[model samples]
Target chain A: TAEALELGRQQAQLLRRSVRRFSTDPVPGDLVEAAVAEALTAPAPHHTRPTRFVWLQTPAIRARLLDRMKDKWRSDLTSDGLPADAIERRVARGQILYDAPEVVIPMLVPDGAHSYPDAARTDAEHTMFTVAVGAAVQALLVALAVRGLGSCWIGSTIFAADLVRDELDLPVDWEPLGAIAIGYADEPSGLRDPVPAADLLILK
Target chain B: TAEALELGRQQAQLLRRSVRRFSTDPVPGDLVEAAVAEALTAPAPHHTRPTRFVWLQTPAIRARLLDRMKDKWRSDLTSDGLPADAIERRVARGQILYDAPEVVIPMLVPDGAHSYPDAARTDAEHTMFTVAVGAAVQALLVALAVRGLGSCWIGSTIFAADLVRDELDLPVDWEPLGAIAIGYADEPSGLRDPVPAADLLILK
Candidate 1:
């Protein structure tokens, strides 16, 4: 029991790598659903769970969504003043989103936030939900990872949240955080040596 | 190996709970250090990691920080026009922060963001860091949980980031998200039934 706990702890929390390159083999539907169940376990504000997964039902659906996102991303960087070549190189790295056999877009709908007086507190509240979505996505990925699924988190879709909602016909309340790419690992493992504690933490 | 992996997966992901009450026994510093190391393994933007832990080295430091947070929380809700009884009731729920034998304040430092022209894009850029810190903190807690330690994430500090920064003598750039309460479980585990997939996910 002790050995099993240690192995799982280390594997899911530490050895869980961002394996973007996924193989052609099929990944089952039930895995993402199981992962979504795990995803909802993440803590949220005011004792309410606010996470939802928007499954891109087919490769065609994922492709259409990714196409719109790529256009938006290019214009997004185009406005940021990157050279065309540089933008191309930057955008080129998002291939994993397209190749991965399964895709799920995680959404965080605003829930259980008490009405606040000032913009400052309200901003923090929104940030809390963002963090909750982050934790949920990470939990989702780790659950998949431990169960022999390799997943990559793709932030490209986040920049095109409106487009995602429009294309998928999602509700106005569902805020897109990003996409999750799921499949078996096609490449070598990317887990690295632990960074020393001294480097990662400070005793104040 | 399959049995071990499955056991580890279920134990770490599905069975991990938010145990607040803790035993008087100590939690080793090495566990937190190992957790911080696992915390660093979380994904971040732009090939850069932006997480740091502020260890409240003594109970005195933890006490001082918690006091300030409670006071700020009172004033924060006072501004929101919440009455005295409700305010005290809400703030009193934060006892787990004070009792946990070991405490760590997680901070997010801004890093690796490309300059953007508009406020809209820049806003999303900052939200990215918030999500990253959320992922890291969840990973930190799970790392502790699987190792037989119980931890709780406290969010009251996020309301008064400056007070925490000044009281703890932290650098200005180190934005406090919240504190983590670490100790051996003194109470029953809080893990519950998994929310069904039909309720948690939507196939779009």
Candidate 2:
């Protein structure tokens, strides 16, 4: 059917993944900028700061980032009394290195829009910041998919947030909430829900 | 040159806007669905629950919402002791409703991921939810823009929070932070830069 190309175009509307394995190909800088620029258009409160994207595709920075993260992770694991095998498995699971060619760090700085007035208000600034980054990430992923690229977001590294921040020379309060791995998928990533709706909504 | 088409594509990229006007047209269902789909894609905390979309666009609902809001605004203006001109100005601004055909209200709900071990910590959790809601609102605006529709987030109505939730039948704790008016733009909008690099950044 002549509509095959048009139907295929809607394939972008079907993308879903927390991408794990990726082809060892390089992600171009322009692609990264285009996607990030689109994500930056995300909304924020009247006084809120914008989401900042840090592209870490170079070998040197990625090596330094992973090494710092591993050091931080090992210290925490040892304190928690993990056995040798468990430590090895955890370390393997924590690999930010040796995965994809590009690592996109989405950072959020609170512009003080939170009005907790008391301790009960909780996590307002941070929640807004994280949500802002998430919107940007969604847009980035969609833009990439529309252009035939696949990417995955990993939040496990959020554990060593401060260490990653210092290593990357990021600003004082710009928190590194998560890191994204971007490249072509090595094989078709099988069924994944973007997220489940019923399990998610709690309407009154 | 093919390059001109690429430049023309630049306008397509500017779909994101804060719309404030509309024709005498009712919003179609698919357009609302498309906007809501873009919003639900916003990131959730720890991948917990999906977010929600509540529409207040029907004629009867809009009439009721505006009436309650007028009482609140008119009283707030009276207490402030505004001069006649200022009162007129405030009421004129209130006329944004006369033209706006749809209102997209977003509420941020916690899926219990924001557990506070004690009372003081609860405030922070609530702040996080508020910020998360802002992201959803931002995504809604961007999605509307992407579809060639326009939106302007109106925070003035937040002054009458109780009336909004009562009318919408939303959960009392769901927190109605704000809403965006969705419609078509009648003129070009000037962009305001929220933060300058010097004030926004603090490199260590």
Candidate 3:
């Protein structure tokens, strides 16, 4: 009997979500290496490979990076006129990285960018690399997901880019975009719930 | 007998690349709609729907947008002191958008962004939206690819954001990230060549 073959691209994308809660099981190195490989294929400005993954292997370095970042975040939130408890709750939510079996921070190096005179063009040039990093991260996430791994991208890392760079001892050119926590899902991550497909299309 | 099932996420991702050439066959509207729906699922700041697609359906509007964009680019290159022939060559390469069977421009409305006290934090806030836009674009392109379509991301559009906004009469909030050209390829896009997977990993 004939059978339907292949998981199409949309199915794979729909299956991916921000999976923060992961099991205690560690992800295989082979899967991560493979995912990073796929990430390298993302479109980058000037054919440059600016995507770097800093895998926090040792517990000491992970703690150092997170602790400094946590401190900085708390101070920023306090200055923003938020209540103490609300700040605590928000900071607590970001502590998910402490639970992940594998934590990887994605960095984008602006090595391929062209110099520009005006501020607008310079900023646009910077965005080109950041966009490449985002594309690469999504590719890495989807690639890992298909291999039965789950990941969540923490946006807080960008706020503490200096702390991340210092703790990781990365090159000056490398800007830490964010941290990604990787592991298997705590429960089965089935297909994502369907959402309304009504997007505004300017078809004139 | 048992058989291997499904094209994994890596396979799907590896199959996607920046394809410029397209056949005369016009892509169905439903496919573009389906891909946009998939793009909506991209991770964004503060649960916001900032992605918008402006489909250049009318040949007149498309020409207007591209023409204005072309004029702006030529001036920029001239200011850069590039020779006339070199400028012509580069501009001609970007004219690939004109022949595309389907040209969709992806925009990011940064309404979901937060204001920050400092410039560093403010720029970071801005980047969150751009990165989200890039992720959405990749999702859209891959979704198109799995449905027997090919696409390319043209970065030149960023240089002519104002021209794009004026010609299309879009809201000021909508910033065109870039243009994507989509259609069936002149030749089948086979698997991409394998590159070394050795990325710098900060494992201290």
Query: Who wins the lDDT comparison?
Result: 1
- Model 2: per-residue Cα lDDT over B171-190, one tens digit each: 67655555567777767565
Once model 3 is optimally superposed onto the true structure by TM-score, how far is the C-alpha of residue A130 displaced, in angstroms? 1.4
Error of 3 at A133 (Å): 1.2
Docking class of 3: medium
The number of clashing residue pairs in each candidate reads 0, 19, 0
TM-score of chain A of each: 0.89, 0.82, 0.90
Ranking by TM-score: 3, 1, 2
User: How high is the CA lDDT of each candidate model?
Assistant: 0.78, 0.59, 0.77
Once fitted onto the true fold, the runs of candidate 1 whose alpha carbons sit more than 4 angstroms away are A1-5, A188-193, B188-193
For candidate 3, the TM-score is 0.94
lDDT of 3 by residue, A5-109 (tens): 245444677768888788898779888877777767777766566678878888888988898988988898898999999999989988788889888888888
Give the alpha carbon lDDT tens digit for every residue of A1-204 in model 2: 324432332233345345667887777766766666665666555567656677775678778778887876777667667787898887886563457777777677766555444342334345545555666666566556555577766554455666777887766777665667788877866432233334333222
**Model 1 residue A19 lDDT?**
84
Q: Spell out the clash pairs found in candidate 3.
A: none
Candidate with maximal DockQ = 1
Q: Write the per-residue lDDT of candidate 1 for residues A1-204, one digit (tens) a residue.
A: 667656755677655778868889988888778778877777676665667788887777788888888898898788778899999998888877888888888888876776676887877777677777888888887888877788887676667878999988877878888778888999758555677767558886
Q: What is the lDDT of candidate 1?
A: 0.78
Of 2 and 3, the candidate ranking higher by DockQ: 3
Worst 10 residues of 2 chain B by lDDT: B195-204
